[PDB]
Design an enzyme around this catalytic site. Structure first.
Site, PDB file in Angstrom:
ATOM      1  N   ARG A  29       1.027  -1.076  -0.065  1.00 55.41           N
ATOM      2  CA  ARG A  29       0.102  -0.024   0.099  1.00 55.41           C
ATOM      3  C   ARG A  29       0.853   1.254   0.035  1.00 55.41           C
ATOM      4  O   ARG A  29       1.793   1.391   0.640  1.00 55.41           O
ATOM      5  CB  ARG A  29      -1.027  -0.138   1.290  1.00 55.41           C
ATOM      6  N   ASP A  34      -4.266   8.665  -1.340  1.00 54.56           N
ATOM      7  CA  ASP A  34      -5.432   8.145  -1.212  1.00 54.56           C
ATOM      8  C   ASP A  34      -6.119   8.281  -2.836  1.00 54.56           C
ATOM      9  O   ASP A  34      -6.195   9.471  -3.288  1.00 54.56           O
ATOM     10  CB  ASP A  34      -6.553   8.564  -0.249  1.00 54.56           C
TER      11      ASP A  34
HETATM   12  C1  LIG Z   1      -1.672   4.411   3.907  1.00 54.23           C
HETATM   13  C2  LIG Z   1      -1.998   3.653   5.150  1.00 54.23           C
HETATM   14  C3  LIG Z   1      -3.333   3.149   5.423  1.00 54.23           C
HETATM   15  N1  LIG Z   1      -3.435   2.614   6.800  1.00 54.23           N
HETATM   16  C4  LIG Z   1      -4.693   1.819   7.207  1.00 54.23           C
HETATM   17  C5  LIG Z   1      -5.596   3.110   7.781  1.00 54.23           C
HETATM   18  C6  LIG Z   1      -6.835   2.638   7.109  1.00 54.23           C
HETATM   19  O1  LIG Z   1      -7.635   2.019   8.064  1.00 54.23           O
HETATM   20  P1  LIG Z   1      -9.466   1.389   7.853  1.00 54.23           P
HETATM   21  O2  LIG Z   1      -9.119   0.359   6.926  1.00 54.23           O
HETATM   22  O3  LIG Z   1      -9.499   0.956   9.314  1.00 54.23           O
HETATM   23  O4  LIG Z   1      -9.686   2.668   7.493  1.00 54.23           O
HETATM   24  C7  LIG Z   1      -6.748   1.813   5.696  1.00 54.23           C
HETATM   25  C8  LIG Z   1      -6.639   2.775   4.688  1.00 54.23           C
HETATM   26  O5  LIG Z   1      -6.254   2.110   3.456  1.00 54.23           O
HETATM   27  P2  LIG Z   1      -6.978   2.226   2.082  1.00 54.23           P
HETATM   28  O6  LIG Z   1      -7.259   3.468   1.522  1.00 54.23           O
HETATM   29  O7  LIG Z   1      -6.429   1.143   0.891  1.00 54.23           O
HETATM   30  O8  LIG Z   1      -8.486   1.466   2.415  1.00 54.23           O
HETATM   31  O9  LIG Z   1      -5.310   1.421   5.636  1.00 54.23           O
HETATM   32  C9  LIG Z   1      -2.232   2.742   7.624  1.00 54.23           C
HETATM   33  O10 LIG Z   1      -2.645   1.946   8.791  1.00 54.23           O
HETATM   34  N2  LIG Z   1      -1.296   3.196   7.323  1.00 54.23           N
HETATM   35  C10 LIG Z   1      -1.004   3.594   6.237  1.00 54.23           C
HETATM   36  O11 LIG Z   1       0.084   4.462   6.061  1.00 54.23           O
HETATM   37 CA   LIG Z   2      -8.457   4.399  -2.122  1.00 52.57          CA
END
Ligand SMILES: Cc1cn([C@H]2C[C@H](OP(=O)(O)O)[C@@H](COP(=O)(O)O)O2)c(=O)[nH]c1=O
Ligand SMILES: [Ca+2]
Length: 129
Positions: A29, A34
């Site tokens: 990721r 976003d």
């Molecule tokens: C980009 C990023 C996302 N995340 C987690 C937080 C968000 O949690 P939740 O799933 O609980 O919202 C989710 C968002 O990713 P996505 O945008 O891929 O869904 O990924 C992190 O923990 N660290 C990061 O650097």
């Molecule tokens: Ca997204």
């Protein structure tokens, strides 16, 4: 920070690719961004932009920041480079992602991406149109 090797296993969407890193398959990721999900506006365009960028690259690299390297879903968290060009940055620059999820100690490239978003926003590109 330092760049490390990986190879593309599969483009997934704007936010993520499956990559092989230290020989093991992983979802990565992208730090600090976003992209719209597929059914949202510019969601398909973001995925196509990323897919093309990572598929055409001769060399894929991952770059971890100072903090957490995997999120709570076991996704690697990194800046992704396609033949030395940062994919995270190029999405923002193009108005196909927003700067987001900027956590302390995992945000070395925050300012570089915020500048890219300013220019995309100034050019009224895509998401900013
Ligand atoms: C980009 C990023 C996302 N995340 C987690 C937080 C968000 O949690 P939740 O799933 O609980 O919202 C989710 C968002 O990713 P996505 O945008 O891929 O869904 O990924 C992190 O923990 N660290 C990061 O650097
Ligand atoms: Ca997204």
């Amino acid at each position: 920070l330092h760049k490390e090797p990986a190879t593309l296993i599969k483009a997934i969407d704007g936010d993520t690719e499956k990559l092989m890193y230290k020989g093991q398959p992983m979802t990565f990721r992208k730090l600090l961004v976003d992209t719209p999900e597929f059914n949202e506006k510019y969601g398909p365009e973001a995925s196509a932009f990323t897919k093309k960028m990572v598929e055409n690259a001769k060399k894929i690299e991952v770059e971890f920041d100072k903090g957490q390297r995997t999120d709570k879903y076991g996704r690697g968290l990194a800046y992704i480079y396609a033949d030395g060009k940062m994919v995270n940055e190029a999405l923002v620059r193009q108005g196909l992602a927003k700067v987001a999820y900027v956590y302390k100690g995992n945000n070395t490239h925050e300012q570089l991406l915020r500048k890219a978003e300013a220019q995309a926003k100034k050019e009224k590109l895509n998401i900013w149109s």
